[PDB]
Amino acid sequence: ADLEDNMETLNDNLKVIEKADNAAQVKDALTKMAAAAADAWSATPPKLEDKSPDSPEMHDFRHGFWILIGQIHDALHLANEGKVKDAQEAAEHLKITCNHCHQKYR
Amino acid sequence: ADLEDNMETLNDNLKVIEKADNAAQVKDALTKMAAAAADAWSATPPKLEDKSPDSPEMHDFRHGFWILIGQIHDALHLANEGKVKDAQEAAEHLKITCNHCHQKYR
Amino acid sequence: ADLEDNMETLNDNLKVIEKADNAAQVKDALTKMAAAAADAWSATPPKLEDKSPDSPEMHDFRHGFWILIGQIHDALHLANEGKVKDAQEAAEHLKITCNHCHQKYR
Amino acid sequence: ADLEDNMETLNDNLKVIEKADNAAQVKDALTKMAAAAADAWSATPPKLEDKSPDSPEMHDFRHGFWILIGQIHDALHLANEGKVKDAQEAAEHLKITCNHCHQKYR
Ligand code: HEC
Ligand code: HEC
Ligand code: HEC
Ligand code: HEC
Ligand SMILES: [Cl-]
Ligand SMILES: [Cl-]
Ligand SMILES: [Cl-]
Ligand SMILES: [Cl-]
Ligand SMILES: [Mg+2]
Ligand SMILES: [Mg+2]
Ligand SMILES: [Mg+2]
Ligand SMILES: [Mg+2]
Ligand SMILES: [Zn+2]
Ligand SMILES: [Zn+2]
Ligand SMILES: [Zn+2]
Ligand SMILES: [Zn+2]
Ligand SMILES: [Zn+2]
Ligand SMILES: [Zn+2]
Ligand SMILES: [Zn+2]
Ligand SMILES: [Zn+2]
Ligand SMILES: [Zn+2]
Ligand SMILES: [Zn+2]
Ligand SMILES: [Zn+2]
Ligand SMILES: [Zn+2]
Ligand SMILES: [Zn+2]
Ligand SMILES: [Zn+2]
């Protein structure tokens, strides 16, 4: 799906996780976030359209997705161990990654 | 690209990294492998075609791509700090990951 | 060094990274933080002093050091590839980790 | 404890994991390996005694422990999810890391 579509999926699921009561709700939302982040990997954002695809900007753009994907991987291990409150707080650590990439490229 | 397409990209670029004589050749191959791994995220392999998407078999299948994506992340940091022998030796690491997923799911 | 000693090292070096003007100053501070985090691995904090060592509370306590050590690993790769603004911004990432463990266990 | 003492702990526990039948045996051994790797962080190996502590050799020596500690972190998540055979195979991925550091520094 397109970069904005993936960002809506990330946004909607981060809010689901915040409001969640149980591990099943949290696991399902993190699974959707993992798929959206992986799908966004290859996107070129509008502000980097005129850069070479090998520019340090596009390199640093993709580095943000490595950080986000790694954080979702850990949050899912914590949810699958039944540590719901820990998985929810780990989902809050995602916000810094969201903000760092937005600050530079949104 | 379909799973088989992404796999040929991973296979071709893993070979380039083993044969490479300079950092630019390793970096280019690692970047292509990262794109192929992220794009493979969404695929259902033939052995799991009749498993539900949000099943445990599909969760366990996708976990191998988190491992691979993390190994490519590290290899690219080694290549970009000029440690090209070290970056190439990351290939021995990636191959174990390739082999574990194939043993279970191919 | 005891836990309190390691914590002062983490606190002092996190400040150096925020104030740093060059890569060498950030790298030196990150290396000191990595040594302090690894050395804190073995500590039993006051709130868990009466929990068994191989208990779940102590496992959950030590998991925060895996997160911190992983964040310092990435920040040092960013500093060593010359991305010093990016390396300093890793401080916002580390501080979340500091705060999550303190909220639960301090 | 000293570097050789930590290496005996890593060796003995890697063999325990290989021979293990259940998740409790695997979890206990990985926990011991996590403590030994963290304790070995700050060691200077005999072959790098005459190098500066900031040499790229000592930097690359410590990088191996980041890789090992990360791999033990994942293996423990897999054991705590009850995926015993996956945790055992993840423990086998440690061998490449063992060999890469030994090849250079043992
Ligand atoms: C870069 C590596 C990013 C990360 C990590 C995240 N986002 Fe993002 N986001 C990014 C860009 C380049 C853009 C702009 C896209 C455009 O075409 O203009 C965005 C945009 C969003 C939006 C707005 C979507 C819209 O208006 O249609 C949202 C709501 C959003 N991003 C949310 C979001 C969240 C919740 C993230 C982490 C969990 C996150 N993004 C990460 C680049 C990057
Ligand atoms: C799961 C997480 C996998 C990882 C990691 C890697 N591979 Fe893979 N690969 C996987 C599957 C399920 C399949 C079969 C796909 C199908 O529809 O047939 C494959 C296939 C290959 C092939 C094709 C040859 C074959 O015998 O089918 C190749 C050449 C291949 N994969 C290479 C490869 C490499 C080099 C990897 C790591 C660097 C790698 N794969 C990882 C599942 C997974
Ligand atoms: C658990 C995994 C922790 C992480 C990660 C960090 N800290 Fe910590 N810190 C922790 C404990 C249990 C304690 C109390 C120790 C005691 O015996 O009293 C502390 C203490 C501190 C202190 C001392 C001040 C206080 O109010 O007790 C400081 C200044 C401190 N920690 C700083 C710090 C920083 C900067 C961290 C991340 C970069 C950090 N800590 C992580 C447990 C854990
Ligand atoms: C560097 C980053 C290393 C990693 C990762 C591992 N080992 Fe190691 N090991 C390392 C050095 C520098 C040495 C030599 C120490 C010396 O003082 O000469 C070793 C040694 C060992 C030994 C021999 C111990 C002895 O003879 O007393 C063993 C059995 C050993 N190492 C096992 C081992 C295993 C099982 C590892 C991964 C699971 C591993 N080591 C990682 C440096 C590094
Ligand atoms: Cl980030
Ligand atoms: Cl794997
Ligand atoms: Cl944390
Ligand atoms: Cl290694
Ligand atoms: Mg738009
Ligand atoms: Mg495709
Ligand atoms: Mg100490
Ligand atoms: Mg000796
Ligand atoms: Zn974890
Ligand atoms: Zn899992
Ligand atoms: Zn946390
Ligand atoms: Zn960041
Ligand atoms: Zn080909
Ligand atoms: Zn690294
Ligand atoms: Zn980079
Ligand atoms: Zn001080
Ligand atoms: Zn990185
Ligand atoms: Zn380095
Ligand atoms: Zn994992
Ligand atoms: Zn755990
Ligand atoms: Zn594996
Ligand atoms: Zn290696």
Q: How was this structure determined?
A: X-ray
Spell out the domain ranges in chain D: 1-106
Is A42 in Cβ contact with B38 (below 8 Å)?
A: yes
> Which amino acid residue places its CA nearest to atom 1 of ligand 1?
A101
What type of residue is D58?
M
DSSP chain A: --HHHHHHHHHHHHHHHHH--SHHHHHHHHHHHHHHHHHHTT---GGGTTS-TTSHHHHHHHHHHHHHHHHHHHHHHHHHTT-HHHHHHHHHHHHHHHHHHHHHH-
d(CA C41, CA B7): 39
Residue B105: how many other CB atoms lie within 10 Å: 15
Closest partner residue to B66 (CB to CB) among A28, A31, A73 is A73
Note the residue count of chain C: 106
Instruction: Please name the residues in contact with C27: beta carbons below 8 A apart, sequence gap of 6 or more.
Output: C76, C79, C80
SS3 category, B21: coil
Is residue A96 within 8 angstroms of chain C, CB to CB? yes
d(CA D7, CA C92): 35
Which of D77, D78, D83, D86 to probe the A interface (max A CBs under 10 A)?
Answer: D77
Is residue A74 within 8 angstroms of chain B, CB to CB? no
Is-contact D33 D95, C-beta < 8 A? no
Tell me the shortest Cα–Cα distance from A42 to chain B, in angstroms.
6
> Which amino acid residue places its CA nearest to atom 37 of ligand 1?
A98
Question: Resolution (in Å) of the shown entry?
Answer: 2.0
Counting one residue from A and one from B, how many pairs have CB atoms under 8 Å apart? Answer: 39
Instruction: Please name the residues in contact with C12: beta carbons below 8 A apart, sequence gap of 6 or more.
Output: none
Tell me the shortest Cα–Cα distance from B65 to chain A, in angstroms.
10
Is residue D34 within 8 angstroms of chain C, CB to CB? yes
